[PDB]
């Protein structure tokens, strides 16, 4: 080819219109580069408007653009670098090393846009992921290949929950993980960088069982939108071409919605409900569909979602609610009660809690736990006002066990040796099932309530009984 030169005609926000010459038209979803003293400004071609004039979205700041500035065309969608070198190296939205390790790239690049896998490709999972977080394991079992979803309030240690998952699950599994952050704070970025250097998952003398794509919200809305796509393609490379299983992580997908809403309005599209982009559904859909367990590989997404003002009747959480396999609700109240995990067990729902899938014993035990807690919640009203004493002997035993169970949920997190100090505990799936069964039978109703509080397994609970006894 030869340079495809365009001249800017209008800089008005992220929208920058370019005037390519005849017979050298670009194509929808190409990537244009404009040489700047800021490096290369990348413009994603998003419309043709007529007479060789495209309307493109900026990915870098639009300050100091001089009218009629020559615009090269790469000729295709933003081409990232992919490799096993992506692991343990941090790259910004346009795929450029912000870890400052210089060139990252194996032998390949890939486009950021990629077609969803076909009906034929799909292969259904049934494997049960272990998080070691007991409440999650029993009462909302996760599945390997799943599309796990961390619906919750405003950053409610939201990062901490995710960090624990990365700390435990990533080292534990042999697969890769991909951490993609959509406009997450640069304070949070520095913490994540430091934290995974500390946990050594990111080891800069060796390999890393995770790659990082940290997106920062100082980047314009367009870059905020298509950071997700960049990360997604890295996961595809792992899934497909490296064939391995993955454990994708995206953060926070409400930011993905917000970013998209902004460039819809910038594109002039009439906004839908609560201002959210008219293309909201299909954009969410494109992201979600792309992530799936195929026969080429398996990718297990954990997508954080921020439920604005804790109202999930707001369309943006609700749209995401459909697309995600294994929902998890983190509640401020439960956090405030001092229970970390902040996961509210009765409000979390995982459709992987199907009786056959987790086995009948697991199912039955978990049904009993669910009933016991639900009874306890119902009884909270009676105990509070009407009084504790009017409760039946049966009710009282159920309440006493429930308070123990409630605080048996409370287990420490290893990455909250910083946010607490108590070392975390990875508890086997089998061990959790066993331990909850025991409690329900009241085999450990000779153990103090506080000796269930903020400790791991049954072995620990028994040990802490001795400690409290002393």
């Amino acid at each position: 080819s030869t340079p495809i030169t365009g001249k800017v005609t209008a800089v008005i926000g992220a929208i920058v219109d370019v005037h390519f010459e005849q017979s050298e038209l670009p194509a929808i979803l190409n990537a244009l580069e404009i040489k700047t003293p800021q490096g290369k400004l990348v413009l994603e071609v998003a419309q043709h408007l007529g007479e060789n004039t495209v309307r493109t979205i900026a990915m870098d700041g639009t300050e100091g653009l001089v009218r009629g500035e020559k615009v090269l065309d790469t000729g295709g969608p933003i081409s990232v670098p992919v490799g096993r070198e992506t692991l343990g190296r941090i790259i910004n939205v346009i795929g450029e090393p912000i870890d400052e390790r210089g060139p990252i790239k194996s032998k390949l690049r890939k486009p950021i846009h990629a077609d969803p896998p076909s009906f034929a490709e799909q292969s259904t999972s049934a494997e049960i992921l272990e998080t070691g977080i007991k409440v999650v394991d029993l009462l909302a079992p996760y599945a390997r290949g799943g599309k796990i979803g961390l619906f919750g309030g405003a950053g409610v240690g939201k990062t901490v929950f995710i960090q624990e998952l990365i700390n435990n699950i990533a080292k534990a599994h042999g697969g890769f993980s991909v951490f993609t952050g959509v406009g997450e704070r640069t304070r949070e970025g520095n913490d994540l960088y430091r934290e995974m250097k500390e946990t050594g998952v990111i080891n800069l003398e060796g390999e890393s069982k995770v790659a990082l794509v940290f997106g920062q919200m100082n980047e314009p809305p367009g870059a905020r939108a298509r950071v997700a796509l960049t990360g997604l393609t890295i996961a595809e490379y792992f899934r497909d071409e490296e064939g391995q299983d993955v454990l994708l992580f995206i953060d926070n997908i409400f930011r993905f919605t917000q970013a998209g809403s902004e460039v819809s309005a910038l594109l002039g599209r009439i906004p839908s409900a609560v201002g959210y982009q008219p293309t909201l559904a299909t954009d969410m859909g494109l992201l979600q569909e792309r992530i799936t367990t195929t026969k080429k590989g398996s990718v297990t997404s954990v997508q954080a979602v921020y439920v604005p003002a804790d109202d999930l009747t707001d369309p943006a959480p609700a749209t995401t609610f459909a697309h995600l396999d294994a929902t998890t609700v983190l509640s401020r109240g439960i956090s405030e009660l001092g229970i970390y995990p902040a996961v509210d067990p009765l409000d979390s729902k995982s459709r992987l809690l199907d009786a056959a899938v987790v086995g009948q014993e697991h199912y039955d035990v978990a049904s009993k736990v669910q009933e016991t807690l639900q009874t306890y919640k119902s009884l909270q009203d009676i105990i509070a006002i009407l009084g504790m004493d009017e409760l039946s002997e049966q009710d009282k035993l159920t309440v006493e066990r429930a308070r123990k169970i409630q605080r048996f949920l409370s287990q420490p997190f290893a990455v909250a040796e910083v946010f607490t100090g108590i070392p975390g505990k990875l508890v086997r799936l089998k061990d959790t099932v066993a331990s909850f069964k025991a409690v329900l039978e009241g085999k450990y109703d000779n153990i103090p309530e506080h000796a269930f509080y903020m400790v791991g397994g049954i072995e620990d609970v028994v040990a802490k009984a001795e400690k409290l006894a002393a």
Partner: protein
């Protein structure tokens, strides 16, 4: 039928006449429409985006739309000076401000002209309005206290340097007073030494009347704190572009402190008024999206602004601008677009509740809706120990209190909570324009948490606080010196304090 901005008849007839201008399509251009303080000039094709353009009237205007023939230059002045067909000559400079230590003791307008008129700014540099946020690599984790001197703020939602903590709450709830308290406590460091242990405070006032600002400077001059503060102001009268530009140039002033490696704190009151200003600016620009009444990209504006405050590494000279946004909530509607956006950006919320203001906590901080994500790592080590279950007690108090107003026969446990809880809220109660030293917040929280005040009658709690401090000042002033000096409570100190508190239970 198409109507192009080049179909203006004077342009059009000139083209037909063959001969047409050039160079007035580079460095000059002729106004052709102008009204609403938004000009549209024909020419200027050497203009760079965000540049400052000198109207021949003498108005200066940034250029925010570069349209396919007519550059839309937002005036910084009234349009009663500007008039059609004027020439504008490109300044050739994107906006920049003088930055220096001379801003200490200066009220300044957006373009950095002393509006207090204490004569020329001693400017150690000039800077540019937009400066991209420092990276992950420049950052280093927070480890620096900021003690506002408000007991609830420090204890419950501690603030550290670099942090983004959003003050949110209803209109004119003495919004300024919450912020002013922090500034006043920075007197304690100001008197002291080690300039990077001093917060040089920048109070940014957007959309506020001159009288309000003038009162603030009087208060600050009364507390002699203008001797370390900068007031950047953009009063309501001052132009909407100047108002839009005001936070970003305040930020630049802050960065100069950061650059020096010093620590500083920027109060952005109100970002909401910036958003209104940007709403009017955008709509006057013909900027297409309504956005629910605030244009799309307002989140981009706020996000870029806020991320320019950070705690930097020691290879970045350990700088740290700390930011405090102030957001008015229209009927407490946090699902309003501007409030939603800001909440995400920030690392804390400091919700203020009106009912509690009336209930007598003044300032009142609804601790349920207040969070500090970063949390303790800037809370004094001692103060962390004492206030450990202060959160639990309050949380229990909240549940119990709901039951309590139905006033049925109380569970003994609940009325223990109720009695303790009532005292705790009263203990928290703040007195406007009067910070408190942390060394003397440690005793009060110890006493309360160790239930010494649970017994003491609710009415005379207010008396007790004052007296207890006086008593310790008289008798255990050695202990106070130790709390100040060592900042974590030893076993001996805890016991000493316990003995002192116990003695003061009966007075």
């Amino acid at each position: 039928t198409k109507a192009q901005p080049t179909e203006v008849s004077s342009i059009l007839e000139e083209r037909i006449k063959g001969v047409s201008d050039e160079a007035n399509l580079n460095e000059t251009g002729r106004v052709l429409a102008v009204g609403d303080g938004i000009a549209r000039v024909f020419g200027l094709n050497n203009i760079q985006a965000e540049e400052l353009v000198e109207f021949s009237s003498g108005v200066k205007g940034m250029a925010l739309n570069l349209e396919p023939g007519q550059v839309g230059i937002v005036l910084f002045g009234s349009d009663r000076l500007v008039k059609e067909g004027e020439l504008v000559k490109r300044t050739g400079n994107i906006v920049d401000v003088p930055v220096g230590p001379g801003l200490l003791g200066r009220v300044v307008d957006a373009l950095g002209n002393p509006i207090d008129g204490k004569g020329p700014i001693d400017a150690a540099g000039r800077s540019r309005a937009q400066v991209k946020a420092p990276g992950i690599l420049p950052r280093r984790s927070v480890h620096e206290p900021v003690q506002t001197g408000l007991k609830a703020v420090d204890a419950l939602v501690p603030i550290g340097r670099g942090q983004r903590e959003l003050i949110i709450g209803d209109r004119q709830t003495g919004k300024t007073a919450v912020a002013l308290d922090t500034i006043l406590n920075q007197k304690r460091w100001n008197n002291g030494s080690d300039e990077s242990k001093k917060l040089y405070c920048v109070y940014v006032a957007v959309g506020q009347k001159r009288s309000t600002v003038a009162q603030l400077v009087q208060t600050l001059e009364q507390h002699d704190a203008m001797k370390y503060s900068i007031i950047v102001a953009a009063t309501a009268s001052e132009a909407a572009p100047l108002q839009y530009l005001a936070p970003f140039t305040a930020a630049s002033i802050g960065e100069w402190f950061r650059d020096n490696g010093k620590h500083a704190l920027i109060v952005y009151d109100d970002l909401s008024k910036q958003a209104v200003a940007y709403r009017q600016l955008s709509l006057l620009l013909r900027r297409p999206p309504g956005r629910e009444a605030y244009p799309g990209d307002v989140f981009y504006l706020h996000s870029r602004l806020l991320e320019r405050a950070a705690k930097l590494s020691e290879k970045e000279g350990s700088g740290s601008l700390t930011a405090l946004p102030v957001i008015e909530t229209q009927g407490g509607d946090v699902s309003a677009y501007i409030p939603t956006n800001v909440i995400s950006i920030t690392d804390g919320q400091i919700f203020l509740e009106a009912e509690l203001f009336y209930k007598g906590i003044r300032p009142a901080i609804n601790v349920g809706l207040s969070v500090s994500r970063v949390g303790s790592a800037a809370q004094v080590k001692a103060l962390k120990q004492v206030a450990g279950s202060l959160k639990l007690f309050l949380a229990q108090y909240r549940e119990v209190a709901a039951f309590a107003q139905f006033g049925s026969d109380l569970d003994a446990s609940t009325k223990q909570t109720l009695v303790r809880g009532e005292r705790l809220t009263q203990l928290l109660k703040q007195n406007q324009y009067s910070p408190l030293a942390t060394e003397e917040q440690v005793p009060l929280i110890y006493a309360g948490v160790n239930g010494h005040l649970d017994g003491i009658e609710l009415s005379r709690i207010g008396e007790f606080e004052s007296s207890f401090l006086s008593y310790l000042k008289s008798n255990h002033n050695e202990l106070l010196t130790e709390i100040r000096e060592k900042g974590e409570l030893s076993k001996e100190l805890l016991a000493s304090l316990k003995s002192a508190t116990e003695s003061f239970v009966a007075t």
